[PDB]
Amino acid sequence: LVHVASVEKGRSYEDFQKVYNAIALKLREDDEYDNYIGYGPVLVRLAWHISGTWDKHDNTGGSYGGTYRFKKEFNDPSNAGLQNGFKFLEPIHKEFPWISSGDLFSLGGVTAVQEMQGPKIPWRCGRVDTPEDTTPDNGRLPDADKDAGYVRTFFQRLNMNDREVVALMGAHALGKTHLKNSGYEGGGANNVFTNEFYLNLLNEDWKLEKNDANNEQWDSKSGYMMLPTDYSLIQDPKYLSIVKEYANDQDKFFKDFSKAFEKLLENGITFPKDAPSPFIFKTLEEQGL
Template sequence: MQAIRSPLRRVALQARLPVVRPRVARPFSTAPEAKSNTTLYLGIAAAVLAGGGYWAYTSSSDTAREVGTVAKSATQAAKAATNFVPSRADYQKVYNRIAETLDEAGEYDDGSYGPVLVRLAWHSSGTYDKETGTGGSNYATMRFEPEALHGANNGLNVARGIMEKIKQEFPWISYGDLWTLGGVAAIQEMQGPKIPWRPGRIDGFAKDATPDGRLPDATQGQDHLRKIFYRMGFNDQEIVALSGAHALGRCHTDRSGFEGPWTFSPTTFTHDYFKLLFDEKWVWRKWSGPKQLADKKTGTLMMLPTDYVLIQDKSFKKYAKAYADNQDLFFKDFSAAFARLLELGVPTAQFVSSEPWELKTLDEQKK
């Protein structure tokens, strides 16, 4: 590793490249950040190529992580300098690799990485604050501490590790595009609706990381849900639609403290989450963990306090009932809300397409 680092340092000194140092705090601004990132990436890309090595970092400090981000983006910048412009077909290849990875989970959870990839896409986007314009999927700041260690992100190191392997195969894609595309692929491959998506997110730095408390707290009620989702710009109908993502996956005591799946088919995207809310009798589970509900009939399913309020709050309930009665309506509304969630915090000018794409599933490509 020292042999790799030394040539890079010499080249950097000879080229008088800028040294990455902690920056003085300044107002949040996306456009200047994108410009300065590009200049820095191109400079360091030249040094990396000239030095014959790739900067690898091992320090856990924010500065080292920022250096690592710049270095990893060097490959992306170098390809751009040689007129490499990813096409829709290139993004379809990334989608396909993600889709193939879903079934490589083995004994992990219910045999699929799909639910945890949806959660990664959701949590990396749901930090957006419309008042300050901060957060969202643009900078993929969950790569940095302390955001990576926020309680709501427990266990997402698994998903980030999966995505890191794919990033090595396709180094030109940004983390924000990769993570959100992972959520799209997971939903679509688990028999969910098509999710319109388009690339254009850029990689940020540790200074762009969001404060804790921006993601939903499952122990809370309807007032908390509205505070979290209204901050992102969503309304009551969209809150309920997005909650339908709980059709997938399960909770873990070593992560959230809660335990169990929401549905009997946690790797298939359906409207069963809403049907079960109305069709089952839910009772408070008697155990040493946090407050959660269990279905009285089997005791194997669970609902969180934030789930249960969807049938207690009058406004939420009418949408939840509509989705319980009509899966097509749920799919349509979820697709629209989830697609918007994945674009929060990304300036429109950054997107490579004026209209989102609908990428094909693996099955569709076989026809």
């Protein structure tokens, strides 16, 4: 399976910056969502989940085809809650109907990260919608109740190494878990992209408790939580070193996250040698908007 990026006809940087701006303006407008967290975190999760179906072995899944729009993937139990992100993007797609679904979902994640004061994430266009029969089966996204070995093995399927995994997981600084979505509850309400996930792991007093869904999670006195898979990053000595690294260097985390997140969003895509360079979008703040 080869998926070749094909630029939406006649479109260039300015077109996608307009889409970015529309997403960013709506992020600012619809600020009440999820107890005033806003839609930032769920858009980041959406971009990750539409990418995280990828399988390096046969190039099935991945962001390219925009298959989350199809019921099988939309209704994946692993994707519970992401419907809110999709609904958010509906008026954006209506205003810019020329953008492909994969481009829109991935761009949503990039926009959210940047607007939440995270690192720049270079982004490339050219994902092309593929038919309903290309939708990957449910079950390719990760379980949260497992250990470091599970996480390591899981991410090998996405061609991610230890540093890439630990960097990507830093997105768990954002938003929260919702009992009705995933069987986990809590996490606060952060919508600013920082390295705080690593600081929280290292600095908080964690207790292994059971939540109201009878699942174990790690809770701190201060009211934070970590999934078992989050906490596994300080149980494994190789992950732990990297956690400490990012806890002590905000810039290094930003740079590594940016690389890993772009890679995640681009897995499975062949870019022609003469494709445009990756775009780096200006934030609303940078534009004075």
